[PDB]
Paper text:
Bedaquiline, an antitubercular drug that targets ATP-synthase, is a key component of a new oral drug regimen that has revolutionized the treatment of multi drug resistant tuberculosis. Clinical bedaquiline resistance in Mycobacterium tuberculosis has rapidly emerged, primarily due to mutations in the transcriptional repressor, Rv0678 that result in upregulation of the Resistance-Nodulation-Division (RND) efflux pump MmpS5/MmpL5 (MmpS5L5). Here, to understand how MmpS5L5 effluxes bedaquiline, we determined the structure of the MmpS5L5 complex using cryo-electron microscopy, revealing a novel trimeric architecture distinct from the canonical tripartite RND efflux pumps of Gram-negative bacteria.
While currently known clinical resistance to bedaquiline is due to pump upregulation, our findings that several MmpL5 variants increase bedaquiline efflux may presage the emergence of additional modes of clinical resistance.
Numbering used by the authors:
A (entry chain A), D (entry chain C): 1 to 31
B (entry chain E): 20 to 493, 688 to 952
C (entry chain F): 740 to 799
The structure:
């Protein structure tokens, strides 16, 4: 449905930001 | 109606005041001070997984010389060439030094043996040195008392006439640096306290309001100090001297920002024309969530600082996070309570001569009507700041950032008068192979390694078993009958391993070994050794390199990776908290871009002032502390300004800009000037590092407060208009109402 | 640089190294050329800015 | 004051520009 995508767009956007941030920080941590 | 939390804090104000006072008293009486618990619970500054530390531990283990990297040197010089009295003094002194065991473990006796005496003596003969390897890692307390013990052992006896003695080395440097930082906190503190009091009398124009605001800051500082000391004393968390220094400076920063925020909002609310109770309730409802969000995002950024790979930053995040939680709790409960009790005690907090507000509304009216050209001017000043940023160098030698009156510095000066090299900071290279090294052809291979290391551009001396003096410039041969002379056996125990499976070379650089070139030399040293062992039966060995420059190259690599990690974490947390606060992705993007541009321009301006005009390079701790403190404070003021801007938009966007500026920019710039000049008055310090850090933070935050936050963010906001709040649908102006 | 690392360790360490010829002259002239072009550009552009500022009374 | 600064902004700006220019030229001539 489109209602579940446009009512929780802020938590989903935050989840994407934290996911890519954690991925990049964990990638640089092993250098 | 009325919210519940401010009513609860307001009604029960004096029990909260008394309880906070009792808790502060208990934590500052039954628990010792932060400097002492930092001293007794210090940590090493190098990683355990760093190749330099592993190499130094391995060198200590193979040659059976301890498990420590700390070392110092004893230097003897005379106005005449040294004679037999110097020999007798040297033998007696190394005897009493080898008597001590619990402080000193190893002593490289080179001047005693006549073979290596020419390698341990000056060209003119008026200087000599010996290296002693002490107990405890660098940055710990144990190395400090080992340095004190060895220097009082040396000073306990009277040298022969005409011959003088000094202590030198990196351990002596760090011990004297700790002593200097201990004893250089009186007169700079005097000028700091007087500039704080004159700045508060300038900002507030009263002696009472300044007194309450100082009470707020000092109570928050004592509460934070006591809480962190309690959590560190009972071994729950870890502490460091660097951690306590950064903790106290960031605690003063956050406390004075929050105190100025609360007091300024209350005074503006009373200046609007309402009575003293709804003024308190509206200042609470206005800035309480602002303080809460700002403090939690700084706490989150400082906690994400703990996910790194450098001991200067791993040991700092949890103390900063906990301390910031106490700061937020104090500014949220003790702050409004004492504002309320001094409000209802009588006539204490009064608005008088409100002229900053009208001037900042004039500035807002200027930035609204012409956003374009003012934005061009602000970006022109930013590009003035940015163009000197690509040219920027660093120095790692800490001798030229200290006063010259330290005993380590005069020992260095005595060493430099007779030695043309940096002989006080050597490097050790070990090669470890899987067979016995007492053989003639293998000795030829060792001479090949020494010659190959010697040919690196910048390496002045290499000391090996083959050529002890440091001139491997001849063809070498060695008949095998030399293994019977006991003096050559002493040399063999001095240089080779006791089991004969490792060889070490002692390498002395040229000029400054802690400069950028000195950092770059050691990779070429390791590469030259690696192509020196190729093709021999020794091919496939383990090459270990230890010393000061190896440690500093490791620290610089970790510094750049750690800067990237902490930058990404901090900017992501800033984006997140702006996304909650505004419900706008474009405003968050604008704010993050403004923050990163402002940081770059400010650090470029500081580099221009220090490296180009004054002529001395910057440190690297200065970059680290500057970016941390400026990131935290900039997030705080940007969040308050954007929240005040969001608070009133319904009556237009341009009117929103002018009203938000006149209601918040004065408070933001008052806090900015107060903290900027407080950090600026550290420039009179005879310690160069802390002067650099203080004035870098001061001029960077002055540039942040005066140009970027006052003329660039409102210009971008008014230029983008109603596309500053996408995805939300907002009008540029409301419906035109009749007159 | 090759001469300077060749005299190292031997007892002529710290001697004076003098190099002359056409190529050395041209290298000195080229280095001086880039610094002096910078100086002349700064002075000329500042004077053009000055005369345009007196003539028009405007900085933009 | 405001009047003496806004009245003579032109000689002040030529003075500041020639001051920075002289500082820079004196810096480069050392090289
Ligand atoms: C830096 C950027 C960080 C984040 C970027 C992701 C941007 C898209 C997130 C969701 C868009 C808003 C939403 O939910 O969408 C909104 C509005 O949707 C639209 O009008 C358009 C839908 C999506 C169009 C956007 C596509 C992506 C465009 C930008 C991509 C990123 C560009 C930068 C890349 C990275 C740079 C390093 C949901 O209607 P609502 O109930 O709220 O009512 C608001 C109704 N006007
Ligand atoms: C290493 C060197 C490389 C270049 C960097 C140079 C340093 C930084 C750059 C520029 C500084 C030079 C310009 C200083 C400001 C000029 C002020 C001016 O013209 O002042 C103008 C405009 O006044 C302003 O409002 C000036 C705004 C400046 C704000 C901040 C000052 C520095 C900004 C630059 C005076 O009109 P007026 O209508 O009242 O008059 C009446 C008769 N026509």
């Amino acid at each position: 449905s489109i209602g579940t995508l446009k009512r929780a767009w802020i938590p989903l956007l935050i989840l994407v930001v934290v996911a890519i941030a954690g991925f990049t920080v964990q990638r640089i941590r092993t250098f | 109606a009325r919210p519940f939390i401010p009513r609860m804090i307001r009604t029960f104000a004096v029990p909260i005041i008394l309880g906070w006072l009792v808790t502060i008293a208990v934590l500052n009486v039954t628990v010792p001070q932060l400097e002492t618990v930092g001293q007794i619970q210090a940590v090493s500054m190098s990683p355990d997984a760093a190749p330099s530390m592993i190499s130094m531990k391995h060198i200590g283990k193979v040659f059976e010389e301890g498990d420590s990297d700390s070392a110092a040197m004893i230097v003897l010089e005379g106005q005449r060439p040294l004679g037999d009295a110097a020999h007798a003094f040297y033998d007696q002194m190394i005897g009493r030094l080898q008597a001590d065991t619990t402080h000193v473990q190893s002593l490289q006796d080179f001047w005693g043996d006549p073979l290596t005496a020419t390698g341990a003596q000056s060209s003119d003969g008026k200087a000599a040195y010996v290296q002693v390897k002490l107990a405890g890692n660098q940055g710990e307390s144990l190395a400090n008392e080992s340095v004190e013990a060895v220097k009082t052992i040396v000073e306990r006896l009277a040298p022969p006439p005409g011959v003088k003695v000094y202590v030198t080395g990196s351990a002596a440097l760090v011990a004297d640096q700790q002593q200097a930082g201990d004893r250089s906190l009186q007169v700079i503190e005097a000028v700091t306290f007087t500039v704080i009091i004159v700045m508060l009398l300038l900002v507030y124009r009263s002696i009472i309001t300044s007194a309450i605001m100082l009470t707020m800051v000092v109570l928050g500082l004592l509460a934070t100090r006591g809480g962190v000391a309690f959590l560190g004393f009972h071994r729950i968390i870890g502490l460091s001297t660097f951690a306590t220094n950064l903790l106290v400076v960031l605690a003063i920063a956050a406390a004075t920002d929050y105190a100025i925020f609360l007091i300024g909002r209350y005074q503006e609310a009373r200046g609007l024309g309402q009575d003293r109770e709804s003024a308190y309730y509206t200042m609470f409802g206005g800035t309480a969530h602002v303080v809460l969000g700002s403090g939690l995002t700084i706490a989150g950024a400082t906690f994400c600082l703990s996910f790194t790979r450098l001991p200067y930053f791993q040991t700092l995040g949890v103390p900063l996070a906990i301390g910031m939680v106490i700061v937020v709790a104090a500014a949220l409960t003790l702050g409004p309570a004492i504002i309320a009790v001094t409000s209802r005690f009588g006539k204490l907090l009064e608005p008088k001569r409100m002229a900053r507000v009208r001037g900042w509304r004039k500035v807002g009216a200027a930035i609204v009507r012409w956003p374009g050209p003012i934005l061009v001017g602000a970006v022109a000043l930013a590009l003035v700041g940015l163009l000197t940023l690509p040219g920027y160098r660093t120095n790692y030698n800490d001798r030229n950032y200290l006063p010259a009156d330290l005993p380590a510095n005069e020992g260095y000066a005595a060493a430099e008068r007779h030695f043309s090299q940096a002989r006080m900071n050597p490097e050790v290279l070990m090669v470890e192979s899987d067979h016995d090294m007492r053989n003639s052809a293998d000795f030829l291979v060792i001479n090949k390694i020494a010659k190959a290391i010697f040919a690196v551009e910048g390496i002045s001396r290499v000391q090996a078993i083959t050529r002890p003096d440091g001139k491997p410039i001849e063809s070498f041969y060695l008949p095998p009958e030399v293994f019977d002379n006991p003096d050559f056996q002493r040399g063999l125990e001095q240089f080779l391993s006791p089991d004969g499976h490792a060889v070490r070379f002692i390498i002395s650089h040229e000029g400054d070994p802690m400069s950028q070139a000195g950092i770059a030399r050691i990779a070429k040293i390791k590469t030259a050794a690696k192509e020196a062992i190729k093709g021999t039966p020794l091919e496939g060995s383990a090459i270990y390199l230890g010393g000061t420059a190896a440690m500093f190259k490791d620290l610089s690599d970790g510094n750049t990776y750690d800067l990237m990690i902490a930058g990404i974490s901090a900017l992501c947390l800033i984006f997140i908290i702006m996304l909650i606060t505004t419900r706008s992705v474009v405003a968050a993007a604008v704010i993050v871009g403004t923050v990163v541009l402002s940081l770059g321009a400010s650090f470029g301006l500081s580099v221009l002032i220090w490296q180009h005009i004054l002529g001395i390079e910057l440190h690297w701790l200065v970059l680290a502390m500057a970016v941390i403190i400026l990131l935290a404070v900039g997030a705080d003021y940007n969040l308050l300004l954007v929240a005040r801007l969001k608070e009133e938009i319904h009556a237009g966007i341009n009117t929103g800009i002018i009203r938000a500026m006149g209601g918040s920019g004065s408070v933001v710039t008052a806090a900015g000037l107060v903290f900027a000049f407080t950090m600026m008055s550290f420039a009179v310090s005879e310690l160069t590092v802390m002067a650099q850090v203080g004035t870098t933070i001061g001029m960077g935050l002055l540039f942040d407060t005066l140009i970027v936050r006052s003329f660039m963010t409102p210009s971008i906001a008014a230029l983008l208009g109603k596309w500053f709040w996408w995805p939300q649908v907002v009008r540029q102006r409301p419906i035109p109402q009749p007159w």
